[PDB]
Amino acid sequence: KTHVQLSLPVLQVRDVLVRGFGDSVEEVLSEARQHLKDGTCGLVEVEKGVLPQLEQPYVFIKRSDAAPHGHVMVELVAELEGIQYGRSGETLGVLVPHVGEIPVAYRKVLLRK
């Protein structure tokens, strides 16, 4: 399937134990896709002061379209020193590894895979 329905646990930035997916744009997109498949991906909602508390490169989910079965259609865009790899809509948040942090909410998305 080109799209996969996921419910991503929303984590508080200060709870996140592993604050990024790796060291290159290509690695973080690779790792983010692997974690999304394995159900070990969390989402941090971007506000003032969030991104400086996480590790670059960043992986964003961005709205790819205007929402089947309550699930917003999204795609992955990486960012490193202010350059984005990918072009998409509004950020729904930043993806991080989930290693058992308690979420505050769930974000229903349809992921272009």
mmCIF file of N, CA and C in Angstrom:
data_model
loop_
_atom_site.group_PDB
_atom_site.id
_atom_site.type_symbol
_atom_site.label_atom_id
_atom_site.label_comp_id
_atom_site.label_asym_id
_atom_site.label_seq_id
_atom_site.Cartn_x
_atom_site.Cartn_y
_atom_site.Cartn_z
ATOM 1 N N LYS A 1 0.859 -1.236 0.000
ATOM 2 C CA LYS A 1 0.000 0.000 0.000
ATOM 3 C C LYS A 1 0.874 1.256 0.000
ATOM 4 N N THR A 2 0.486 2.270 -0.768
ATOM 5 C CA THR A 2 1.187 3.581 -0.848
ATOM 6 C C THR A 2 0.933 4.416 0.411
ATOM 7 N N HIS A 3 -0.139 4.125 1.156
ATOM 8 C CA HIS A 3 -0.458 4.875 2.398
ATOM 9 C C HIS A 3 -0.776 3.895 3.523
ATOM 10 N N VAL A 4 -0.400 4.265 4.750
ATOM 11 C CA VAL A 4 -0.611 3.432 5.970
ATOM 12 C C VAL A 4 -1.208 4.313 7.070
ATOM 13 N N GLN A 5 -2.361 3.890 7.591
ATOM 14 C CA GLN A 5 -3.050 4.530 8.738
ATOM 15 C C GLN A 5 -2.209 4.264 9.982
ATOM 16 N N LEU A 6 -1.796 5.327 10.657
ATOM 17 C CA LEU A 6 -1.044 5.214 11.922
ATOM 18 C C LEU A 6 -1.677 6.143 12.940
ATOM 19 N N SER A 7 -1.556 5.770 14.214
ATOM 20 C CA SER A 7 -1.846 6.638 15.376
ATOM 21 C C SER A 7 -0.526 6.815 16.135
ATOM 22 N N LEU A 8 0.031 8.018 16.061
ATOM 23 C CA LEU A 8 1.377 8.322 16.601
ATOM 24 C C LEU A 8 1.205 8.853 18.008
ATOM 25 N N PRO A 9 1.926 8.279 18.994
ATOM 26 C CA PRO A 9 1.906 8.805 20.355
ATOM 27 C C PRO A 9 2.587 10.184 20.366
ATOM 28 N N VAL A 10 1.905 11.179 20.928
ATOM 29 C CA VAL A 10 2.427 12.562 21.038
ATOM 30 C C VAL A 10 3.212 12.636 22.352
ATOM 31 N N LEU A 11 4.502 12.951 22.280
ATOM 32 C CA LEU A 11 5.391 13.003 23.468
ATOM 33 C C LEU A 11 5.697 14.461 23.826
ATOM 34 N N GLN A 12 5.861 14.734 25.118
ATOM 35 C CA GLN A 12 6.402 16.028 25.607
ATOM 36 C C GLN A 12 7.903 16.040 25.321
ATOM 37 N N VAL A 13 8.416 17.150 24.785
ATOM 38 C CA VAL A 13 9.845 17.262 24.368
ATOM 39 C C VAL A 13 10.769 16.885 25.527
ATOM 40 N N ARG A 14 10.462 17.291 26.753
ATOM 41 C CA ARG A 14 11.368 17.039 27.905
ATOM 42 C C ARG A 14 11.354 15.572 28.342
ATOM 43 N N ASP A 15 10.417 14.747 27.863
ATOM 44 C CA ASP A 15 10.398 13.294 28.189
ATOM 45 C C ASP A 15 11.244 12.505 27.199
ATOM 46 N N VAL A 16 11.540 13.080 26.044
ATOM 47 C CA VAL A 16 12.110 12.283 24.940
ATOM 48 C C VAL A 16 13.535 11.849 25.290
ATOM 49 N N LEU A 17 13.775 10.544 25.277
ATOM 50 C CA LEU A 17 15.085 9.962 25.651
ATOM 51 C C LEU A 17 16.035 9.931 24.461
ATOM 52 N N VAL A 18 15.530 9.700 23.259
ATOM 53 C CA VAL A 18 16.401 9.623 22.059
ATOM 54 C C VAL A 18 15.883 10.690 21.105
ATOM 55 N N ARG A 19 16.667 11.748 20.925
ATOM 56 C CA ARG A 19 16.141 13.070 20.502
ATOM 57 C C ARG A 19 16.301 13.243 18.990
ATOM 58 N N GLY A 20 16.633 12.174 18.281
ATOM 59 C CA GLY A 20 16.667 12.188 16.809
ATOM 60 C C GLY A 20 16.941 10.809 16.283
ATOM 61 N N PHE A 21 17.002 10.685 14.963
ATOM 62 C CA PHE A 21 17.067 9.388 14.256
ATOM 63 C C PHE A 21 18.467 9.108 13.706
ATOM 64 N N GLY A 22 19.395 10.048 13.784
ATOM 65 C CA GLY A 22 20.745 9.814 13.251
ATOM 66 C C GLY A 22 21.393 11.086 12.757
ATOM 67 N N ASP A 23 22.372 10.932 11.873
ATOM 68 C CA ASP A 23 23.437 11.942 11.690
ATOM 69 C C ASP A 23 23.432 12.527 10.281
ATOM 70 N N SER A 24 22.615 12.011 9.369
ATOM 71 C CA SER A 24 22.529 12.520 7.977
ATOM 72 C C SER A 24 21.058 12.616 7.601
ATOM 73 N N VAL A 25 20.719 13.496 6.662
ATOM 74 C CA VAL A 25 19.319 13.616 6.156
ATOM 75 C C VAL A 25 18.855 12.228 5.728
ATOM 76 N N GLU A 26 19.696 11.530 4.967
ATOM 77 C CA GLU A 26 19.295 10.228 4.380
ATOM 78 C C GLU A 26 19.054 9.206 5.507
ATOM 79 N N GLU A 27 19.894 9.222 6.545
ATOM 80 C CA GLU A 27 19.760 8.254 7.673
ATOM 81 C C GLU A 27 18.483 8.547 8.473
ATOM 82 N N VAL A 28 18.175 9.810 8.745
ATOM 83 C CA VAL A 28 17.030 10.146 9.642
ATOM 84 C C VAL A 28 15.724 9.791 8.922
ATOM 85 N N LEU A 29 15.631 10.041 7.608
ATOM 86 C CA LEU A 29 14.431 9.657 6.824
ATOM 87 C C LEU A 29 14.304 8.131 6.797
ATOM 88 N N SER A 30 15.415 7.415 6.591
ATOM 89 C CA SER A 30 15.469 5.925 6.582
ATOM 90 C C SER A 30 14.958 5.393 7.923
ATOM 91 N N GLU A 31 15.557 5.891 9.006
ATOM 92 C CA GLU A 31 15.282 5.411 10.393
ATOM 93 C C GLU A 31 13.835 5.742 10.768
ATOM 94 N N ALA A 32 13.357 6.931 10.397
ATOM 95 C CA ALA A 32 11.983 7.390 10.704
ATOM 96 C C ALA A 32 10.993 6.421 10.044
ATOM 97 N N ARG A 33 11.231 6.085 8.774
ATOM 98 C CA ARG A 33 10.375 5.116 8.033
ATOM 99 C C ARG A 33 10.428 3.744 8.707
ATOM 100 N N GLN A 34 11.612 3.277 9.098
ATOM 101 C CA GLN A 34 11.729 1.979 9.816
ATOM 102 C C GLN A 34 10.910 2.005 11.127
ATOM 103 N N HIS A 35 11.028 3.058 11.931
ATOM 104 C CA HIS A 35 10.318 3.206 13.238
ATOM 105 C C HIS A 35 8.804 3.306 13.010
ATOM 106 N N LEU A 36 8.400 3.996 11.950
ATOM 107 C CA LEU A 36 6.965 4.124 11.598
ATOM 108 C C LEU A 36 6.405 2.741 11.263
ATOM 109 N N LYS A 37 7.135 1.933 10.501
ATOM 110 C CA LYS A 37 6.730 0.548 10.166
ATOM 111 C C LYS A 37 6.680 -0.291 11.455
ATOM 112 N N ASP A 38 7.654 -0.158 12.379
ATOM 113 C CA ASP A 38 7.804 -1.046 13.573
ATOM 114 C C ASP A 38 6.931 -0.561 14.739
ATOM 115 N N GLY A 39 6.246 0.569 14.590
ATOM 116 C CA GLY A 39 5.380 1.145 15.634
ATOM 117 C C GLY A 39 6.164 1.742 16.789
ATOM 118 N N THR A 40 7.398 2.175 16.544
ATOM 119 C CA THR A 40 8.335 2.693 17.577
ATOM 120 C C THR A 40 8.679 4.156 17.250
ATOM 121 N N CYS A 41 7.715 4.900 16.729
ATOM 122 C CA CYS A 41 7.872 6.323 16.357
ATOM 123 C C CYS A 41 6.919 7.156 17.208
ATOM 124 N N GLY A 42 7.425 8.250 17.762
ATOM 125 C CA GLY A 42 6.591 9.251 18.436
ATOM 126 C C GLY A 42 6.658 10.572 17.705
ATOM 127 N N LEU A 43 5.804 11.490 18.121
ATOM 128 C CA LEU A 43 5.581 12.807 17.485
ATOM 129 C C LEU A 43 5.691 13.854 18.577
ATOM 130 N N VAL A 44 6.476 14.898 18.335
ATOM 131 C CA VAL A 44 6.560 16.094 19.220
ATOM 132 C C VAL A 44 5.988 17.289 18.468
ATOM 133 N N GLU A 45 4.980 17.926 19.052
ATOM 134 C CA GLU A 45 4.297 19.089 18.440
ATOM 135 C C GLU A 45 5.265 20.272 18.532
ATOM 136 N N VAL A 46 5.485 20.961 17.413
ATOM 137 C CA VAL A 46 6.528 22.023 17.324
ATOM 138 C C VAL A 46 5.909 23.292 17.898
ATOM 139 N N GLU A 47 6.549 23.824 18.936
ATOM 140 C CA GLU A 47 6.282 25.154 19.526
ATOM 141 C C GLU A 47 7.637 25.808 19.788
ATOM 142 N N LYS A 48 7.597 27.069 20.206
ATOM 143 C CA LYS A 48 8.781 27.871 20.603
ATOM 144 C C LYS A 48 9.618 27.014 21.552
ATOM 145 N N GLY A 49 10.892 26.826 21.233
ATOM 146 C CA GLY A 49 11.885 26.218 22.137
ATOM 147 C C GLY A 49 11.943 24.707 22.028
ATOM 148 N N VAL A 50 11.050 24.087 21.254
ATOM 149 C CA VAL A 50 11.063 22.599 21.062
ATOM 150 C C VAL A 50 12.280 22.171 20.253
ATOM 151 N N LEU A 51 12.477 22.726 19.056
ATOM 152 C CA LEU A 51 13.474 22.180 18.105
ATOM 153 C C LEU A 51 14.893 22.307 18.651
ATOM 154 N N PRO A 52 15.279 23.401 19.356
ATOM 155 C CA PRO A 52 16.622 23.478 19.936
ATOM 156 C C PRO A 52 16.858 22.387 21.000
ATOM 157 N N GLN A 53 15.798 21.758 21.512
ATOM 158 C CA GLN A 53 15.914 20.659 22.508
ATOM 159 C C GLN A 53 16.026 19.293 21.817
ATOM 160 N N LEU A 54 15.900 19.233 20.492
ATOM 161 C CA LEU A 54 16.034 17.970 19.723
ATOM 162 C C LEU A 54 17.286 18.021 18.850
ATOM 163 N N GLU A 55 17.678 16.879 18.298
ATOM 164 C CA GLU A 55 18.923 16.743 17.518
ATOM 165 C C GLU A 55 18.593 16.858 16.028
ATOM 166 N N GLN A 56 19.398 17.610 15.295
ATOM 167 C CA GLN A 56 19.341 17.665 13.811
ATOM 168 C C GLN A 56 20.182 16.533 13.249
ATOM 169 N N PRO A 57 19.937 16.041 12.010
ATOM 170 C CA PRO A 57 18.784 16.460 11.210
ATOM 171 C C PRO A 57 17.431 16.112 11.858
ATOM 172 N N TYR A 58 16.430 16.980 11.674
ATOM 173 C CA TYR A 58 15.016 16.789 12.076
ATOM 174 C C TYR A 58 14.243 16.054 10.977
ATOM 175 N N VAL A 59 13.277 15.229 11.387
ATOM 176 C CA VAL A 59 12.272 14.652 10.454
ATOM 177 C C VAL A 59 10.914 15.211 10.835
ATOM 178 N N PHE A 60 10.293 15.963 9.925
ATOM 179 C CA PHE A 60 8.925 16.508 10.119
ATOM 180 C C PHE A 60 7.917 15.585 9.437
ATOM 181 N N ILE A 61 6.714 15.475 10.002
ATOM 182 C CA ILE A 61 5.497 15.140 9.208
ATOM 183 C C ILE A 61 4.800 16.446 8.842
ATOM 184 N N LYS A 62 4.495 16.564 7.552
ATOM 185 C CA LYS A 62 3.874 17.748 6.934
ATOM 186 C C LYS A 62 2.608 17.316 6.181
ATOM 187 N N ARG A 63 1.559 18.132 6.237
ATOM 188 C CA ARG A 63 0.250 17.813 5.622
ATOM 189 C C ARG A 63 0.463 17.777 4.106
ATOM 190 N N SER A 64 0.075 16.687 3.439
ATOM 191 C CA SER A 64 0.357 16.469 1.997
ATOM 192 C C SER A 64 -0.893 16.804 1.182
ATOM 193 N N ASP A 65 -1.991 17.190 1.846
ATOM 194 C CA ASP A 65 -3.354 17.277 1.245
ATOM 195 C C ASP A 65 -4.398 17.620 2.324
ATOM 196 N N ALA A 66 -5.508 18.270 1.915
ATOM 197 C CA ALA A 66 -6.746 18.544 2.701
ATOM 198 C C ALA A 66 -7.850 17.539 2.323
ATOM 199 N N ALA A 67 -8.846 14.440 4.730
ATOM 200 C CA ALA A 67 -8.381 13.672 5.914
ATOM 201 C C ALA A 67 -9.238 12.427 6.085
ATOM 202 N N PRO A 68 -8.925 11.327 5.361
ATOM 203 C CA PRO A 68 -9.700 10.082 5.429
ATOM 204 C C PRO A 68 -9.776 9.426 6.814
ATOM 205 N N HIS A 69 -10.989 9.042 7.231
ATOM 206 C CA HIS A 69 -11.273 8.269 8.473
ATOM 207 C C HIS A 69 -10.705 9.008 9.694
ATOM 208 N N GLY A 70 -10.686 10.351 9.661
ATOM 209 C CA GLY A 70 -10.091 11.227 10.693
ATOM 210 C C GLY A 70 -8.574 11.364 10.571
ATOM 211 N N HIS A 71 -7.931 10.565 9.704
ATOM 212 C CA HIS A 71 -6.460 10.502 9.498
ATOM 213 C C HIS A 71 -6.010 11.541 8.468
ATOM 214 N N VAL A 72 -5.221 12.523 8.916
ATOM 215 C CA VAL A 72 -4.620 13.589 8.061
ATOM 216 C C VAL A 72 -3.532 12.955 7.193
ATOM 217 N N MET A 73 -3.549 13.243 5.890
ATOM 218 C CA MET A 73 -2.531 12.700 4.963
ATOM 219 C C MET A 73 -1.247 13.502 5.160
ATOM 220 N N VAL A 74 -0.143 12.801 5.372
ATOM 221 C CA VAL A 74 1.152 13.459 5.668
ATOM 222 C C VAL A 74 2.261 12.781 4.880
ATOM 223 N N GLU A 75 3.364 13.513 4.762
ATOM 224 C CA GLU A 75 4.626 12.959 4.236
ATOM 225 C C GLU A 75 5.814 13.462 5.064
ATOM 226 N N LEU A 76 6.944 12.789 4.899
ATOM 227 C CA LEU A 76 8.204 13.099 5.620
ATOM 228 C C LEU A 76 9.003 14.168 4.867
ATOM 229 N N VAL A 77 9.508 15.147 5.612
ATOM 230 C CA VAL A 77 10.502 16.164 5.162
ATOM 231 C C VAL A 77 11.594 16.276 6.231
ATOM 232 N N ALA A 78 12.854 16.100 5.850
ATOM 233 C CA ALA A 78 14.004 16.300 6.757
ATOM 234 C C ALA A 78 14.511 17.737 6.648
ATOM 235 N N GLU A 79 15.163 18.193 7.720
ATOM 236 C CA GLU A 79 15.786 19.538 7.790
ATOM 237 C C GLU A 79 17.151 19.439 8.481
ATOM 238 N N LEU A 80 18.164 20.084 7.887
ATOM 239 C CA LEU A 80 19.551 20.177 8.411
ATOM 240 C C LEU A 80 20.081 21.582 8.111
ATOM 241 N N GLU A 81 20.476 22.284 9.176
ATOM 242 C CA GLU A 81 20.984 23.682 9.149
ATOM 243 C C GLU A 81 20.132 24.508 8.180
ATOM 244 N N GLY A 82 18.802 24.484 8.369
ATOM 245 C CA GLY A 82 17.841 25.399 7.730
ATOM 246 C C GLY A 82 17.531 25.030 6.287
ATOM 247 N N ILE A 83 18.019 23.888 5.811
ATOM 248 C CA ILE A 83 17.659 23.372 4.460
ATOM 249 C C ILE A 83 16.784 22.127 4.625
ATOM 250 N N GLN A 84 15.626 22.131 3.965
ATOM 251 C CA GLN A 84 14.615 21.043 3.958
ATOM 252 C C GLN A 84 14.772 20.195 2.697
ATOM 253 N N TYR A 85 14.640 18.891 2.867
ATOM 254 C CA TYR A 85 14.753 17.886 1.787
ATOM 255 C C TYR A 85 13.374 17.267 1.644
ATOM 256 N N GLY A 86 12.685 17.749 0.620
ATOM 257 C CA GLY A 86 11.233 17.627 0.496
ATOM 258 C C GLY A 86 10.554 18.975 0.562
ATOM 259 N N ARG A 87 9.345 18.973 0.043
ATOM 260 C CA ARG A 87 8.465 20.137 -0.105
ATOM 261 C C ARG A 87 7.073 19.636 0.257
ATOM 262 N N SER A 88 6.396 20.253 1.219
ATOM 263 C CA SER A 88 5.053 19.781 1.645
ATOM 264 C C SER A 88 4.339 20.893 2.412
ATOM 265 N N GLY A 89 3.211 20.558 3.037
ATOM 266 C CA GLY A 89 2.351 21.534 3.727
ATOM 267 C C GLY A 89 2.808 21.796 5.153
ATOM 268 N N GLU A 90 1.849 22.195 5.974
ATOM 269 C CA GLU A 90 2.022 22.623 7.375
ATOM 270 C C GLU A 90 2.595 21.455 8.190
ATOM 271 N N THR A 91 3.558 21.740 9.058
ATOM 272 C CA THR A 91 4.160 20.757 9.990
ATOM 273 C C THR A 91 3.104 20.323 11.006
ATOM 274 N N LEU A 92 2.897 19.019 11.169
ATOM 275 C CA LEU A 92 2.069 18.452 12.266
ATOM 276 C C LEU A 92 2.966 18.164 13.479
ATOM 277 N N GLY A 93 4.273 18.024 13.243
ATOM 278 C CA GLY A 93 5.279 17.927 14.317
ATOM 279 C C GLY A 93 6.568 17.265 13.867
ATOM 280 N N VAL A 94 7.429 16.986 14.838
ATOM 281 C CA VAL A 94 8.762 16.392 14.582
ATOM 282 C C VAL A 94 8.716 14.949 15.078
ATOM 283 N N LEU A 95 9.225 14.017 14.273
ATOM 284 C CA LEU A 95 9.254 12.585 14.619
ATOM 285 C C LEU A 95 10.506 12.294 15.437
ATOM 286 N N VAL A 96 10.348 11.406 16.425
ATOM 287 C CA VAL A 96 11.460 10.921 17.282
ATOM 288 C C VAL A 96 11.239 9.436 17.529
ATOM 289 N N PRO A 97 12.301 8.696 17.858
ATOM 290 C CA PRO A 97 12.147 7.364 18.410
ATOM 291 C C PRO A 97 11.245 7.425 19.646
ATOM 292 N N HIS A 98 10.399 6.411 19.782
ATOM 293 C CA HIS A 98 9.594 6.129 20.994
ATOM 294 C C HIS A 98 10.213 4.922 21.691
ATOM 295 N N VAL A 99 10.647 5.104 22.928
ATOM 296 C CA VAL A 99 11.304 4.026 23.718
ATOM 297 C C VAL A 99 10.561 3.901 25.053
ATOM 298 N N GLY A 100 9.234 4.056 25.036
ATOM 299 C CA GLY A 100 8.355 3.784 26.193
ATOM 300 C C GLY A 100 7.917 5.030 26.938
ATOM 301 N N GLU A 101 8.219 6.228 26.443
ATOM 302 C CA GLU A 101 7.692 7.480 27.048
ATOM 303 C C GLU A 101 6.159 7.438 27.064
ATOM 304 N N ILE A 102 5.527 7.936 28.124
ATOM 305 C CA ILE A 102 4.044 8.040 28.191
ATOM 306 C C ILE A 102 3.589 9.210 27.334
ATOM 307 N N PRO A 103 2.666 8.981 26.369
ATOM 308 C CA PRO A 103 2.162 10.063 25.538
ATOM 309 C C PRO A 103 1.098 10.916 26.237
ATOM 310 N N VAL A 104 0.864 12.113 25.706
ATOM 311 C CA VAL A 104 -0.202 13.034 26.199
ATOM 312 C C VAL A 104 -1.416 12.925 25.275
ATOM 313 N N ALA A 105 -1.249 12.327 24.094
ATOM 314 C CA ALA A 105 -2.303 12.262 23.061
ATOM 315 C C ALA A 105 -1.825 11.357 21.935
ATOM 316 N N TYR A 106 -2.695 11.138 20.968
ATOM 317 C CA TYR A 106 -2.395 10.364 19.745
ATOM 318 C C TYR A 106 -2.779 11.242 18.567
ATOM 319 N N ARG A 107 -1.994 11.196 17.495
ATOM 320 C CA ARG A 107 -2.238 11.960 16.248
ATOM 321 C C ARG A 107 -2.471 10.936 15.140
ATOM 322 N N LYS A 108 -3.708 10.858 14.642
ATOM 323 C CA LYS A 108 -4.111 9.938 13.544
ATOM 324 C C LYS A 108 -3.607 10.530 12.232
ATOM 325 N N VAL A 109 -2.798 9.774 11.497
ATOM 326 C CA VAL A 109 -2.249 10.245 10.193
ATOM 327 C C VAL A 109 -2.389 9.104 9.198
ATOM 328 N N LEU A 110 -2.505 9.464 7.923
ATOM 329 C CA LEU A 110 -2.324 8.545 6.774
ATOM 330 C C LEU A 110 -0.971 8.881 6.147
ATOM 331 N N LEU A 111 0.018 7.997 6.309
ATOM 332 C CA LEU A 111 1.423 8.256 5.903
ATOM 333 C C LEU A 111 1.649 7.778 4.470
ATOM 334 N N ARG A 112 2.037 8.675 3.559
ATOM 335 C CA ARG A 112 2.583 8.289 2.230
ATOM 336 C C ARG A 112 3.879 7.500 2.453
ATOM 337 N N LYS A 113 3.855 6.210 2.099
ATOM 338 C CA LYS A 113 4.939 5.215 2.288
ATOM 339 C C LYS A 113 5.404 4.726 0.912
#
